[PDB]
Design a protein around this ligand. Structure first.
Ligand SMILES: C[C@@H]1O[C@@H](O[C@@H]2[C@@H](O[C@H]3O[C@H](CO)[C@H](O)[C@H](O)[C@H]3O)[C@@H](O)[C@@H](CO)O[C@H]2O)[C@@H](O)[C@H](O)[C@@H]1O
Ligand SMILES: C[C@@H]1O[C@@H](O[C@@H]2[C@@H](O[C@H]3O[C@H](CO)[C@H](O)[C@H](O)[C@H]3O)[C@@H](O)[C@@H](CO)O[C@H]2O)[C@@H](O)[C@H](O)[C@@H]1O
Lengths: 301, 301
């Protein structure tokens, strides 16, 4: 079964780490950064990893019930989380946290909504601090703050729709949350990725995400767009080597702009030595060329 | 090229008319309703129709700039809309409105966000009344209300992230907006669908969407889940007849629960005479069985 990528332009790709479209391709030196995202992780044979699941809208969402208001706390609530489809999260599941759980540290801004058993409804702005000691999705519980303390009901079906960042301070896209809280190690993680081959860098699919306030340009970089993950999952084609050579191609001119290594574990490297935003034609897309080895030498971008 | 559906359970499907997961299958008598959704429209050969586009998160979103505050209006703003990827919308485009434009009448609740050219950012709750005379996406302009009038900047990159309904009153999922405003007819519409064959009803993929306030259970029914549309688009397989026989199958037991007609124009009918929520196994999914004619007699559910 021949290996394929979906035919999708940059304007037809979704970020796999936050529910927004891809804005651009991006590459930079790895430096001292540990790149270990848990969303947007999929081996080329279609095996999902970390906290990766198939629903793009569900990335960074939460579901469950508000069991109680935080003691001595105004505008802060305790949530018992379930899976995206509302089923109980089993903490013994061999995963870092419920699938779709955010994989970055920061204050996530969005809207908390409820429909009570009697169909009484409410929506209110909310923030979820993923860097907080009270953020323990792996234990089935997180904390949610609102601006107004009065209008949130207890033990009623609750959802969180992510919108963007509350603030930029403390936001680090590569710093994983402590899914189980303080002094506890994360488990079942998709491994970190790094460009091993000399002269190579990771190529990212970048989105500039919304911000509630302040001056900044917060970005989320994913290793594979969500659609590629969805495609890989369906195809389940056996990887023939540890690297698929892919070529970014303009379908109109036939011009192959550049080539890249799509690694078996689900990330892309390119021969590039600086941090730039690639600028590709709107009609262009990666096409699978052939299987090669990890030591194949790419044409420098 | 053999026709296929993606292998996806109900818990792996996204609504094509609002950016949320599918909750359930649903069927009811058509009655006097005109079912003519513009999102979630795709022929079986992969031809997108109405306002349908590929990005699930982008459904019911808006992008553009706030050109001015509505005269003599507090908390109401004018938006000049662009396409999802930020490109200019061309009103001469042979479509009812910019792709992704909501296709139902009501008050849409969400979050308006901006990043100024200087990277100054803000997010604020917002409502977009699609039943309003000022809702004219086909003309490249809509109106957006906020709660606070002060903190929205003019001529700065703006996005709207949909969350749910502001209110239930006036919400009709089958009543299209007047995309060009008062006294103007919609154009380039995907045609209405209806069960022609005696004893048949449309089968829908239903989601219960969030609500800002009041007591209600607002639902959005789509004809095809977004993933099926994405799959059809990629496959572009030629339809061999006007109807694909599909069978909802439990992959574990092998039990075929029921069968349905998947029509060439992209909707499903079933032999069913009442309005019920189907209840299918979590592991189940439709599988293509064969091409048949429009007059094939389905086993009653
Ligand atoms: C850069 C600046 O960011 C925002 O104003 C902040 C403000 O942040 C919050 O409060 C305001 C309302 O006062 C808005 O709701 C923001 O969206 C919130 O994030 C505060 O932190 C104050 C503290 O003095 O600093 C301001 O700069 C935003 O509203 C402004 O438009 C502007 O972009
Ligand atoms: C059924 C009821 O709906 C909501 O309260 C409404 C309220 O609606 C808005 O204002 C409140 C705050 O006062 C909340 O923000 C709602 O989310 C808003 O939609 C008003 O319409 C009042 C008018 O008297 O009626 C209330 O019923 C909701 O807050 C309640 O929890 C409840 O579900």
């Amino acid at each position: 079964k021949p290996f394929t990528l979906p035919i999708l332009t940059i304007g037809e790709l979704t970020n796999s780490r936050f529910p927004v479209p891809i804005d651009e391709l991006y590459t930079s030196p790895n430096e001292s950064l540990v790149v270990q995202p848990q969303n947007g992780r999929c081996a080329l044979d279609g095996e999902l990893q970390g906290t990766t699941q198939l629903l793009p809208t569900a990335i960074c969402s939460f579901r469950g019930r508000i069991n109680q208001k935080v003691s001595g706390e105004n505008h802060v609530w305790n949530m018992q989380v379930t899976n995206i489809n509302g089923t109980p999260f089993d903490p013994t599941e061999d995963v870092p946290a419920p699938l779709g759980t955010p994989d970055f540290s920061g204050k996530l801004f969005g809207v908390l909504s409820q429909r009570d058993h009697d169909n009484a409804c409410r929506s209110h702005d909310a923030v979820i601090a993923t860097n907080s000691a009270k953020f323990t999705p792996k234990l089935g519980a997180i904390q949610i703050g609102t601006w107004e303390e009065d209008d949130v009901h207890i033990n009623q079906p609750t959802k969180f729709t992510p919108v963007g960042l509350f603030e930029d301070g403390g936001f680090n896209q590569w710093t994983l949350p402590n899914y189980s809280g303080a002094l506890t190690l994360n488990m079942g993680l998709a491994p970190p990725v790094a460009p091993t081959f000399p002269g190579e860098q990771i190529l990212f699919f970048r989105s500039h995400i919304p911000l509630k306030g302040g001056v900044a340009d917060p970005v989320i970089d994913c290793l594979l767009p969500q659609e590629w993950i969805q495609h890989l999952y369906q195809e389940s084609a056996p990887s023939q080597s540890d690297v698929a050579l892919i070529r970014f191609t303009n379908p109109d001119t036939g011009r192959v702009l550049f080539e890249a290594k799509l690694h078996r574990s689900g990330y892309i490297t390119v021969a590039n030595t600086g941090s730039r935003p690639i600028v590709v034609p709107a009609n262009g897309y990666f096409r699978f060329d052939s299987w090669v080895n990890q030591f194949y030498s790419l044409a420098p971008m």
